[PDB]
Write a protein that binds this DNA or RNA. Structure first.
Ligand SMILES: [Mg+2]
Ligand SMILES: [Zn+2]
Lengths: 191, 160, 200, 52
RNA sequence: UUCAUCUAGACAGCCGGACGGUGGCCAUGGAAGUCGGAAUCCGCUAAGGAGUGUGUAACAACUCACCGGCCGAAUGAACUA
C-alpha cells in the first residue's frame, strides 16, 4: 500500500555510543563493541538528540515496513547486549543416563563435548561461537550458562547444543532427554 | 490421633439402607465400621426416604455424628411432600407437584443465614430457582414468574 | 449497550456520593470473589462496597466534580485494582471490618510479598529430595533421616520485595503462609478531605 | 524418571506443539497456519497427541 | 463488502478474581459444571455458564467464557475477487 513514512525509535542509554555508517551499525557499551551489517534492508537512520535514533522507511511496502521493525529490534538487541549482556541457561534433562557435558580444547577450538546421551558411545561436539562464555552453574544441578554481548551468537550456540542432542528412532514424547534452554535473560540482574 | 475431627458432607437418598458400596470407600480408610454409619444415615434421613438429601458426618475418635444437611433442593422436595418413592423401579419420577408459597418462603428463611442475599425476597428467589431446577411449580406459576413478581413487590415476602 | 450501562453506573455512583458521606479507597488486589463475599456480608447495612473500572470511575468523578469540586484529591487515588467502599458510618469500625479478612496463602509466586519473612527453626517434615530450594538459597538446615529441620531463622525475602520463584515455591511447600490476602484500604475519604487509611 | 520441572521444560519443546494435517509438520503450539509452502500454508492444524 | 468494538479506554499481551444456593433435576454401580436427557434460574455482584476445555472411580486439582489491573489508538469477524 506504500505507506508514505514509517518510523521507529531506538533509545540510546548513557554509556553507549552508536556510530552508523551507511547500514553498518557499531554499538559501543560497557561490555564491548558489536557491529552489524544491515545493507540488505534499505532503511534510513537518523540521530535526533544523541540519546534517540529514528529508523525510517519511506514509501515502503508491507514487507518493507515489517523489516523496519525487525531492524529496530536488532539494534535494540545490540544495545542491550553491550549494556546488560545476554545469558541463556540450559538444563540437562535425562531419564536414566546423566549427560556428561564439559569444555574441551581441540587445537584451541573450545568445543563443548557431550557423552553418554541416551547411553550413546558417540562423542557429540559443539563449537563455541566466538564471544560466547560458558560457565557451569553451581547450586543448580546440571545447568550450563552461555553468556555474551550478542544474542545471535549466544542463542545460536545454545540452539546448536540443543539440536545436537535430539533423540532418534524413539518416541520423543517419552524419551525427553536433551539439553534445553530453561532461561533466557540478561547478565546483569533486573536492569 | 482419635481427636481428629473430619467433616463428611455427602448427598445421599434419605431414610433408606444406603449403598454400602458407596459409603464404605470413604469411611473405611478413616477406621469406621460401615454398618454404624448406615444406621446413622438411615435414621437421620428417615423423614427424607426417597428424598436425596445431603447429610454431613462429623468423625472423631473412630465414631460418626450424622446431621442431615438442610439442602435447599431436598427441603424443596420435602415441601412437595411425596411419600417414600419406589425409586428402585419408579425411575424418572417427575417430582414437580405444586407448593404454596408458604413452604418455599420458610425454606428460604432456613437458608438465609448462610446465603448472602440481602433480602428474604432474594433468598426466596434463590429457593425458587432451586424449584425451577426441580421443575416444581409454585401456586400454578413458574418459579421464575414468582421471582419476577417478588421483584415487582406483588408477592411481598415478609422480611422476617 | 455500553452507553446505557455506563450511564447507569455513573448515576448509581452519584447516588452513593450524596447519601454516603465518606469513602474507603481499598486495594482489593488478590481478593477472591468469596473473600469479598464475606467482607460485603459483614459490611451489609453498615457500609457498601462499589466496584468500577478505574477509567470509568475517573470519568464519572470528573463529571461529578463538575458540581462537587472536592474530589481532585480522589482523582489520583483511583489507580489499580481499588474499590470504593462508601460509608455513612464511623470510619474506625469500617476500617476494622475491612481489615478482618486476611486469608493467608503460602508465598504466592511472583506477587509482591507484603511481610518480612522470618523462617523460624522448625522440623519441615517434607520429603528429603526437595532440599533443592534450601540448597540453592543457602538457608542452613540439617537433613536428619529425610525429614529436614530448619536450624536457624532465615529472611529469604521481605515485605515489598517480589518473591523470587525459588523462595516462593520454597515457602509454598514449607506451608508458611505470609501472603495474607484481604482488601487493604489504601486511602479513606473523610467528609471533604481524604486521609491515608493508616490512622484508622 | 525425570523430575516434573525438567519434564515440563522438555515437553515445552517436544510435546507442547501442533501438527499440520496435510503435511504432518511440527508447528508451534499456538500457530494458526503451517509454515511449509508444500501444504499451501494450511490452517488445518491439530494438537500433537499427548503421551498416555 | 457487510457487521461489530473503541478515550465512558478497543484487540493482543502480561497479572487478579472467576463465587454461593447447588453434589441443581432425572437417571448410572460411580457422574459433584465437564459419560447421557431435559431444565439454564436466582442471589452476592466490577464478575463469573447449573459451564469452555484438561482431568478424577466419583472427588479433587487446573483452564476458559465473564469482569477486573497495566499500556493508551485504533481494532476484530465473516465474506468478495
Ligand atoms: Mg521403536
Ligand atoms: Zn502444513
Amino acid at each position: 500500500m506504500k505507506y508514505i513514512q514509517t518510523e521507529q525509535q531506538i533509545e540510546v542509554p548513557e554509556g553507549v555510543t552508536v556510530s552508523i555508517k551507511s547500514r553498518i551499525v557499531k554499538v559501543v557499551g560497557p561490555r564491548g563493541t558489536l557491529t552489524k551489517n544491515l545493507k540488505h534492508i534499505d532503511v534510513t537512520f537518523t540521530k535526533v538528540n544523541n540519546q534517540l535514533i529514528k529508523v525510517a522507511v519511506h514509501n515502503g511496502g508491507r514487507k518493507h515496513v515489517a523489516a523496519l521493525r525487525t531492524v529496530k529490534s536488532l539494534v535494540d538487541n545490540m544495545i542491550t547486549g553491550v549494556t546488560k549482556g545476554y545469558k541463556y541457561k540450559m538444563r540437562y534433562v535425562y531419564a536414566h543416563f546423566p549427560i556428561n557435558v564439559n569444555i574441551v580444547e581441540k587445537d584451541g577450538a573450545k568445543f563443548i563435548e557431550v557423552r553418554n546421551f541416551l547411553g550413546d558411545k558417540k562423542i557429540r561436539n559443539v563449537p563455541v561461537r566466538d564471544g560466547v562464555t560458558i560457565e557451569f552453574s553451581t547450586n543448580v544441578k546440571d545447568e550450563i550458562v552461555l553468556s555474551g554481548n550478542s544474542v545471535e551468537d549466544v542463542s545460536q550456540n545454545a540452539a546448536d547444543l540443543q539440536q545436537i542432542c535430539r533423540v532418534r528412532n524413539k518416541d520423543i514424547r517419552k524419551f525427553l532427554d536433551g539439553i534445553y534452554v530453561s532461561h533466557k535473560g540478561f547478565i546483569t540482574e533486573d536492569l | 490421633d482419635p481427636n481428629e475431627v473430619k467433616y463428611l458432607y455427602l448427598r445421599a437418598v434419605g431414610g433408606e439402607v444406603g449403598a454400602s458400596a458407596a459409603l464404605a470407600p470413604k469411611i473405611g480408610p478413616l477406621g469406621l465400621s460401615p454398618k454404624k454409619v448406615g444406621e446413622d444415615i438411615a435414621k437421620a434421613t428417615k423423614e427424607f426416604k426417597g428424598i436425596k438429601v445431603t447429610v454431613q458426618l462429623k468423625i472423631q475418635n473412630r465414631q460418626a455424628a450424622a446431621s442431615v444437611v438442610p439442602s435447599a433442593s431436598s427441603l424443596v422436595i420435602t415441601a412437595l411432600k411425596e411419600p417414600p418413592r419406589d425409586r428402585k423401579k419408579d425411575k424418572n419420577v417427575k417430582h414437580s407437584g405444586n407448593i404454596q408459597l408458604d413452604e418455599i418462603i420458610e425454606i428460604a428463611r432456613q437458608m438465609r443465614d448462610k446465603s448472602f442475599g440481602r433480602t428474604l425476597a432474594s433468598v426466596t428467589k434463590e429457593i425458587l430457582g432451586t424449584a425451577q431446577s426441580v421443575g416444581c411449580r409454585v401456586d400454578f406459576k413458574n418459579p421464575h414468574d414468582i421471582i419476577e413478581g417478588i421483584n415487582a413487590g406483588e408477592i411481598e415476602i415478609p422480611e422476617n | 449497550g455500553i452507553r446505557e450501562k455506563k450511564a447507569e453506573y455513573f448515576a448509581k455512583l452519584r447516588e452513593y456520593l450524596e447519601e454516603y458521606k465518606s469513602l474507603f479507597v481499598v486495594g482489593v488486589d488478590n481478593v477472591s470473589s468469596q473473600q469479598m463475599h464475606e467482607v460485603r456480608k459483614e459490611l451489609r447495612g453498615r457500609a457498601v462496597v462499589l466496584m468500577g473500572k478505574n477509567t470509568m470511575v475517573r470519568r464519572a468523578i470528573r463529571g461529578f466534580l463538575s458540581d462537587l469540586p472536592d474530589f481532585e484529591k480522589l482523582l489520583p487515588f483511583v489507580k489499580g485494582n481499588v474499590g470504593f467502599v462508601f460509608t455513612n458510618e464511623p470510619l474506625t469500625e469500617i476500617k476494622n471490618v475491612i481489615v478482618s479478612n486476611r486469608v493467608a496463602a503460602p508465598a504466592r509466586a511472583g506477587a509482591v510479598a507484603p511481610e518480612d519473612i522470618w523462617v523460624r527453626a522448625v522440623n519441615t517434615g517434607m520429603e528429603p529430595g526437595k532440599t533443592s530450594f534450601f540448597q540453592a538459597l543457602g538457608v542452613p538446615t540439617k537433613i536428619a533421616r529425610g525429614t529436614i529441620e530448619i536450624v536457624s531463622d532465615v529472611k529469604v525475602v521481605d515485605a515489598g520485595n517480589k518473591v523470587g520463584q525459588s523462595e516462593a515455591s520454597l515457602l509454598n511447600l514449607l506451608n508458611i503462609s505470609p501472603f495474607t490476602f484481604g482488601l487493604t484500604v489504601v486511602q479513606v475519604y473523610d467528609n471533604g478531605q481524604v486521609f491515608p487509611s493508616s490512622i484508622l | 524418571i525425570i523430575e516434573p520441572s525438567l519434564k515440563a521444560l522438555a515437553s515445552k519443546y517436544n510435546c507442547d506443539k501442533s501438527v499440520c494435517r496435510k503435511c504432518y509438520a511440527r508447528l508451534p503450539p499456538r500457530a494458526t497456519n503451517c509454515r511449509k509452502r508444500k501444504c499451501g500454508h494450511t490452517n488445518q492444524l491439530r494438537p500433537k497427541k499427548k503421551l498416555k
